């Protein structure tokens, strides 16, 4: 389908205990490929996907530098927020950004974004025209005025529309053998009594990539979603994802119920029964 590169910064202050912590994670689609964690005597941008071995060694030095500088500005930003919101120096607070670009399967750009949060709430966001801002409150309006006066939106649009897209295409090629092979789910259903009258059927989908999936129970061929328990998609730990959907049924009625598994690595949707 489409593809994305996404970055997520987290900055957390710790009054009394030294400098804020600062973490970057970077994703292509549903696979993390880099990390930066300031909690080291000499922190480095580090690979988190093996195809990242294909970059030039300067990449790590250059990305490490940018991570370190970004950590410094977020330590200033944390302090600035204390002034904007008239908060004391005593408590720990959080800054976050996320940004990325999206691309069709053919590599054509179609969406970029950039958003900021303070203490877990929207702070300021780049609008979808990528030329204007939405401030969540009067505190953030300070930042909106600042960034409008300084034409920051254009620097954001420059990166999101060009270098973001170019690098995304380069990583997709770099990691084609994994990034672009969809692992289909390995599915199966299990049987566990509820009453002596009732039993629960659970439909498992394991080991699939990417993360988007459709797991539904049908009774007599029509969808049953007001009686299905459906856990959130969860990581396997090896880069694959997991999900299950369950439904309680009267005894004997098992052949009425079917499980429909739709996923991009499946030539056609799977149908399973007990």
């Amino acid at each position: 389908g489409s593809h994305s590169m996404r970055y997520f910064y987290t900055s957390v202050s710790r009054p009394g205990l030294g400098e804020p912590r600062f973490i970057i994670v970077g994703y292509v689609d549903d696979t993390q490929f880099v990390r930066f964690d300031s909690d080291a005597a000499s922190p480095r941008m580090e690979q988190r996907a093996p195809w990242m071995g294909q970059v030039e060694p300067e990449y790590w030095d250059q990305q490490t530098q940018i991570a370190k500088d970004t950590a410094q500005t977020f330590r200033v930003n944390l302090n600035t927020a204390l002034r904007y919101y008239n908060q004391s120096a005593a408590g720990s607070h959080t800054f976050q950004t996320m940004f990325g670009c999206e691309v069709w399967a053919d590599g054509r750009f179609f969406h970029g974004y950039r958003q900021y949060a303070y203490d877990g709430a929207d702070y300021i966001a780049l609008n979808e025209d990528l030329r204007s801002w939405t401030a969540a409150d009067t505190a953030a309006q300070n930042t909106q005025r600042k960034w409008e006066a300084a034409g920051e939106a254009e620097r954001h649009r420059a990166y999101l529309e060009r270098e973001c897209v170019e690098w995304l295409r380069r990583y997709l090629e770099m990691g084609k053998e994994t990034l672009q092979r969809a692992d289909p789910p390995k599915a199966h259903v299990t049987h566990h009594p509820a009453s002596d009258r009732e039993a629960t059927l659970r439909c498992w989908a394991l080991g699939f990539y990417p993360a988007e999936i459709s797991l539904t129970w049908q009774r007599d061929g029509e969808d049953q979603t007001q009686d299905t328990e459906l856990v959130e998609t969860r990581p396997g730990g090896d880069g694959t994802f997991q999900k299950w959907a369950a439904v309680v049924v009267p005894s004997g009625e098992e052949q009425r119920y079917t499980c429909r598994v739709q996923h991009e690595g499946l030539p056609e949707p799977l149908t399973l029964t007990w």
């Binding site: 990305q63 930042t143 600042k146």
Partner: peptide, 9 residues
């Protein structure tokens, strides 16, 4: 990759 450039709130 990231590019240089910093944004102070």
């Amino acid at each position: 990759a990231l590019m240089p450039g910093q944004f102070f709130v």
